[PDB]
Amino acid sequence: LDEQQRKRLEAFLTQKQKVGELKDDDFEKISELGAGNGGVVFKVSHKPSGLVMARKLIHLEIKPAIRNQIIRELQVLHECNSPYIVGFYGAFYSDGEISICMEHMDGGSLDQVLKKAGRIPEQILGKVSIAVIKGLTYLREKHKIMHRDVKPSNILVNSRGEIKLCDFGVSGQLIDAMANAFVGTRSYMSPERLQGTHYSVQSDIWSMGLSLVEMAVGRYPIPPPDAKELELMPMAIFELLDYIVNEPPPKLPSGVFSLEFQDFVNKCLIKNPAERADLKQLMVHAFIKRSDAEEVDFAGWLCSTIGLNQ
Amino acid sequence: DDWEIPDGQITVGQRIGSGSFGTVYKGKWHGDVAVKMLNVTAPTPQQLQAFKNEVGVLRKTRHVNILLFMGYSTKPQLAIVTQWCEGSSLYHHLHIIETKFEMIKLIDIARQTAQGMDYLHAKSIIHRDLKSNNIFLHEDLTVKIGDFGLATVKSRWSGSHQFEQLSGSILWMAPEVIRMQDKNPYSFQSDVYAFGIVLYELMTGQLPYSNINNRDQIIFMVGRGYLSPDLSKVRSNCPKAMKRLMAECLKKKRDERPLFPQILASIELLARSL
Ligand SMILES: Nc1ncnc2c1ncn2[C@@H]1O[C@H](COP(=O)(O)OP(=O)(O)NP(=O)(O)O)[C@@H](O)[C@H]1O
Ligand SMILES: Nc1ncnc2c1ncn2[C@@H]1O[C@H](COP(=O)(O)OP(=O)(O)NP(=O)(O)O)[C@@H](O)[C@H]1O
Ligand SMILES: O=C(NC[C@H](O)CO)c1ccncc1Nc1ccc(I)cc1F
Ligand SMILES: [Mg+2]
Ligand SMILES: [Mg+2]
């Protein structure tokens, strides 16, 4: 890491020390940030330290033994300290819900930014790809844990131009508990996971690509856009999963985007996990070497899109 | 013959929880009731009339193992009022409290469930959402089945059409239901499949697919016939005539599954031979 990152990383650890045992009465609810099919998130003020954090509340109906194991497994997050991983303050249980307390990201998830923006620019998706790759790397090496849930709603951004990951599978017991959830509407699961199990980092990389295409076109790309819906520049859950497995992978439109970017996503979306690019390859792909050279103003593009001041 | 509760009649109280198609509050209305605030809060008049028609049939249901459907309301928002049950659901007992029943009482739970299901099918009512979450053990004795029917307040409507966006928990869904590509997937045999899974819960104390922790993997493999409940996990003390019955309910092809009249008969027969 460089200097502006080592400054911010050490600055987080300082504010983290001012926080001791996390209790439910120490929090004042400000506003709700978002919700999904299995959680709700509030911006909260921690009265003992004045800090403002994000508080994810998961209401699970599980036996206490399993619940206590989940809290225990979540405490590993005190060791994830990277500029590409969202900050972690603590996790606890109370009033029948699991709380995960993490640092606030005033830009929100790229899923939100995408709605406000319509489509996201390739120059910006360049910088995003860099961060998601570096975040998967830090997870693969320093902790040997794999995300298992890459999607736009788990990539968070903020007004300081940072792009961080979160909601990565550190607690398997939580993952397995969330398996008895109701069906979603759409999937970012690679075709090998739909048929078998995780195939190391490669099956996350598929997810990254499917997110890049969604953000690049402004639409979840399964099934691919119509012939004239594309020059304008509801499928069942099971059929999408059958499509992802038994139909050719999605791609970008040939005219609008560079050839480096189209290849980048294509190497990511190879249906065979082994042929699919790994982190080492993508890290030195053409599209990444170019997008790392470009001096894009991400913070400015974010605040303009949301409507905030510079 | 116009069952509609006005405002100020329902003392809405504590929030309990949400499920596949609504959020449940403990209310008051000539006694404790269950107020489920449906997720279709703004219903279309074509949708709204089909909901009324369905409530008419659910109101004429009276059976010892069925939760009393009392009516609905639309004033604050569209909602559902049903009998409130003390004590936990069968899902709570098996997977949270880990209650230790005897094989006699386990089999008895199965029997009254099949009893009420047989009544529902006798009145041509497809439950569509049978699970141990929707089976309450009233006063640690009688079984009460709720959340039945209601095909119209499940799956948003277009304007005059309706297509069941698969919703619910996927563990109890029959494969033909998973695939959602057989004109009318929800059938008497799709309930029987669900009931089969509930048998698996009773007989193994576990939920199915205990080794799989990927929601969409289950959805795909179960829908493609590749994944099936590992019946190996049945307890040793469990009757053979019980395991066989469970397996006939879980057949991948819905036409091979038994109907409840035959299912109920098997349970009573093996309840004696005990
Ligand atoms: N630390 C955070 N700061 C700001 N917004 C956040 C934070 N964590 C979560 N969110 C927001 O909360 C929303 C919902 O939370 P989340 O539980 O991740 O649901 P989801 O990822 O959108 N969908 P799902 O995973 O299927 O439940 C996200 O879309 C984000 O906008
Ligand atoms: N009639 C009722 N009386 C008491 N508690 C109830 C009643 N109906 C539901 N509940 C409880 O309300 C919570 C949510 O219920 P519900 O919305 O029906 O979710 P679910 O049953 O788990 N899935 P589903 O029934 O298909 O939507 C659970 O803790 C239930 O046990
Ligand atoms: O949250 C999880 N899975 C989806 C859940 O439904 C929330 O949407 C989840 C599962 C397993 N391990 C950790 C999880 N969380 C999590 C992890 C890291 C950070 I930094 C912040 C987080 F919140
Ligand atoms: Mg998430
Ligand atoms: Mg229920």
Read off the CATH number of the domain in which B31 is found: 3.30.200.20
**B243 to chain A nearest CA, in Å?**
24
Do B153 and B254 reside in the same domain of the chain? yes
| A105 Cα nearest atom in ligand 1 | 3
Please give the method by which this entry was determined: X-ray
Among B58, B83, B108, the domain-final residue is: B83
Sign of CA dihedral A141, A145, A151, A155: negative
For residue A223, whether the previous peptide bond is cis, meaning omega lies within 30 degrees of 0, is yes
* HEC assignment per residue over chain B: CCCEECCCCCCCCCEEEECCCEEEEEEECCCEEEEEEECCCCCCHHHHHHHHHHHHHHHCCCCCCECCEEEEECCCCCEEEEECCCCCEHHHHHHCCCCCCCHHHHHHHHHHHHHHHHHHHHCCCCCCCCCHHHEEEECCCEEEECCCCCCCCCCCECCCCECCCCCCEHHHCCHHHHHCCCCCCCCHHHHHHHHHHHHHHHHHCCCCCCCCCCHHHHHHHHHCCCCCCCHHHCCCCCCHHHHHHHHHHCCCCHHHCCCHHHHHHHHHHHHHCC
* The one-letter amino acid at B105: K
**For residue A87, how many C-alpha atoms fall within 13 Å in the half-sphere facing its CB?**
20
Q: Are strands B69-73 and B4-5 parallel, antiparallel or unpaired?
A: parallel
Using the Cβ of B16 and the Cβ atoms of chain A, whether some distance falls under 8 Å is answered with no
Contact B260, B192 (CB under 8 A): yes
Per-residue buried b or exposed e for B135-155, using 16+ beta carbons within 10 Å of the residue's own CB: bbbeeeeebbbbbbbbbbbbe
- Three-state DSSP string of A73-101: HHHHHHCCCCCCECCEEEEEEECCEEEEE
Backbone Cα Rg of chain A: 19
Give the ligand 3 atom nearest the CA of A56: 23
Reference A71, options A33, A101, A37, A45; nearest CA is A101
Amino acid at B19: G
Residue at which a domain ends, from B83, B99, B126:
B83
Tokens representing A135 are: 């975040």
Is residue B158 within 8 angstroms of chain A, CB to CB? no
Determine the Cα–Cα distance for residues B131 and B204; give it in Å rounded to an integer.
Answer: 15
Q: Are strands A155-157 and B135-138 parallel, antiparallel or unpaired?
A: unpaired
Rounded Cα–Cα distance for residues B185 and A15 (Å): 55
d(CA A63, CA A67): 6
* Rounded Cα distance, B130 and B148, in Å: 7
Reported resolution, Å: 3.1
Encoding tokens for residue B19? 């499920």
A162 lines ligand 1 (CB under 6 A): no
One domain, residues B74 and B132: no
> Is the same domain home to B110 and B166?
yes
Instruction: Give the C-alpha separation, A146 to A220, whole Å.
Output: 23
- d(C-alpha A78, C-alpha A16), whole Å: 10
Helices B188-204, B103-122: crossing angle, 10 deg rounding: 170
State whether the Cα torsion A292-A296-A300-A305 is positive or negative: negative
> Last residue of some domain: B83, B116, B144?
B83
Same domain, B137 and B51: no
> Which value, to the nearest 10 degrees, does the dihedral of the CA atoms of residues B120, B122, B126, B131 take?
40
Instruction: Name B21's Cβ contacts closer than 8 Å, sequence gap at least 6.
Output: B38, B39, B150, B153, B154, B167
Q: Are residues B15 and B146 in the same domain?
A: no
Angle at which helices A286-293 and A259-268 cross, to 10°: 130
Domain that holds residue B79: 4-83
Residues B34 and B125 in one domain: no
Binding residues of B for ATP: 16-24, 36
For atom 2 of ligand 3, the residue with the nearest CA is A167
What is the C-alpha to C-alpha distance for residues A44 and A42, in angstroms, rounded to an integer?
6
H/E segment holding residue A132: helix A122-142
Delineate the domains of chain A, giving CATH numbers in brackets. Answer: 1-106 (no CATH), 107-310 (1.10.510.10)
Alpha-carbon distance of A99 to A178, in angstroms, equals 15
The C-alpha torsion from A189 through A195 and A200 to A203, rounded to 10°, is -30
The answer to whether residues B225 and B188 belong to one domain is yes
Radius of gyration over every alpha carbon of chain B, rounded to an integer in angstroms:
19
Determine the 3-state secondary structure of A306 from DSSP. Answer: helix
Q: Which residues contact A119 (CB under 8 A, 6 or more apart)?
A: A215, A216, A217, A218
A167 lines ligand 1 (CB under 6 A): yes
Is residue A176 less than 8 Å (CB to CB) from chain B?
Answer: yes
Order across the sheet with B15-18: list the strands.
B4-5, B69-73, B79-83, B32-38, B22-28, B15-18
Tell me: do B52 and B182 sit in the same domain. no
Among B96, B168, B219, the residue with its CB nearest the CB of A63 is B96
Shared-domain flag, residues B114 and B9: no
- Pairing state between β B135-138 and B142-145: antiparallel
**Contact of A114 with A218, CB cutoff 8 Å:** yes
Residues 6+ apart with CB under 8 A from B36: B22, B23, B24, B25, B79, B80, B81, B82
Instruction: Give every CB contact of residue B229 below 8 A, 6+ residues apart in sequence.
Output: B197, B200, B208, B209, B250
**Residue carrying structure tokens 């940072």:** A162
What's the maximum distance between 2 C-alpha atoms anywhere in chain A? Answer: 57
Q: Is residue A270 a contact partner of residue A277, using CB atoms and an 8 Å limit?
A: yes
Residue B88 identity (one-letter amino acid): S
The CATH code of the domain that includes B227 is 1.10.510.10
Please spell the DSSP secondary structure of A141-187, one letter per residue.
Answer: HHS----S--SGGGEEE-TTS-EEE------HHHHHHGGGSBP-S--
In angstroms, the CA A198 to CA A273 distance is 10
Kindly state if the Cβ of A114 falls inside 6 Å of ligand 3: no
Rounded Cα gap, residues A51 and A27, in angstroms:
10
**Pairwise CB contact (< 8 Å): B220 & A59:** no
Helix (H) or strand (E) holding A12: helix A3-17
C-alpha to C-alpha distance for B235 and A169, rounded to whole angstroms: 32
Q: Is the CB of B148 under 6 A from ligand 2?
A: no
Q: How far is the centre of ligand 1, averaged over its atoms, from the C-alpha of B67 (Å)? A: 36
A271: its two tokens: 């249906």
According to DSSP, residue A199 is labeled: B
Pair A40, A55: CB distance under 8 Å:
no
CB atoms within 10 A of CB A106: 17
B20 lines ligand 2 (CB under 6 A): yes
- Tell me the best of A16, A37, A168 to mutate to test the pocket of ligand 3, counting ligand atoms within 8 Å of each CB and taking the most: A168
Nearest to B256 by CA among B264, B265, B247: B247
Which atom number of ligand 2 is nearest to the Cα of residue B168?
Answer: 26
| B118/B147 Cα distance (integer angstroms) | 16
Q: Evaluate the CA torsion angle A299, A220, A151, B20 in order and state its sign.
A: positive
B21 touches chain A (CB under 8 A): no
- Shared-domain flag, residues B79 and B97: no
Give Cβ neighbours of residue B227 (< 8 Å, ≥ 6 apart): B209, B212, B218, B221
Does any CB of chain A come closer than 8 Å to the CB of residue B165? yes
Instruction: Establish whether B255 is a catalytic residue.
Output: no
Distance CA B141, CA B146 (A): 16
Residues B161 and B267 in one domain: yes
In degrees and rounded to multiples of 5, residue B180 shows phi and psi of: 60, 30
Distance CA B266, CA B210 (A): 28
- For residue A55, the surrounding DSSP H or E stretch is strand A52-58
Going from the Cα of B23 to the center of ligand 2, the distance in angstroms, rounded, reads 8
Across the interface, whether the CB atoms of A237 and B219 are under 8 A apart is answered yes
Q: Do A221 and A210 form a contact (C-beta atoms < 8 A)?
A: yes
Place of tokens 């903020």: A158
The H or E element spanning position A44 is strand A39-46
Can you read off the two tokens belonging to residue B23? 């959020």
Output the residue whose Cα is nearest ligand 1's atom 31. A109
Cα angle A294, A299, A300 (rounded to 5 degrees) comes to 90
Same domain? B138 vs B249: yes
Distances (CA, A) of B255 to B93, B106, B164, B171, B258: 32, 28, 21, 20, 8
With contact defined as beta carbons under 8 Å apart, do B86 and B138 qualify?
A: yes
Residue nearest to atom 9 of ligand 2 (CA): B24
A182: tokens are 């109701």
Measured CA to CA in angstroms, residue B263 lies from A149, A202, B115, B117 at distances of: 42, 47, 9, 10
User: Can you state the percent helix, strand and coil of chain A, rounding each to 5?
Assistant: 45, 15, 40
Q: How many domains does chain B have?
A: 2
Quick one: CA torsion of A58, A61, A62, A67, rounded to 10 degrees? 30
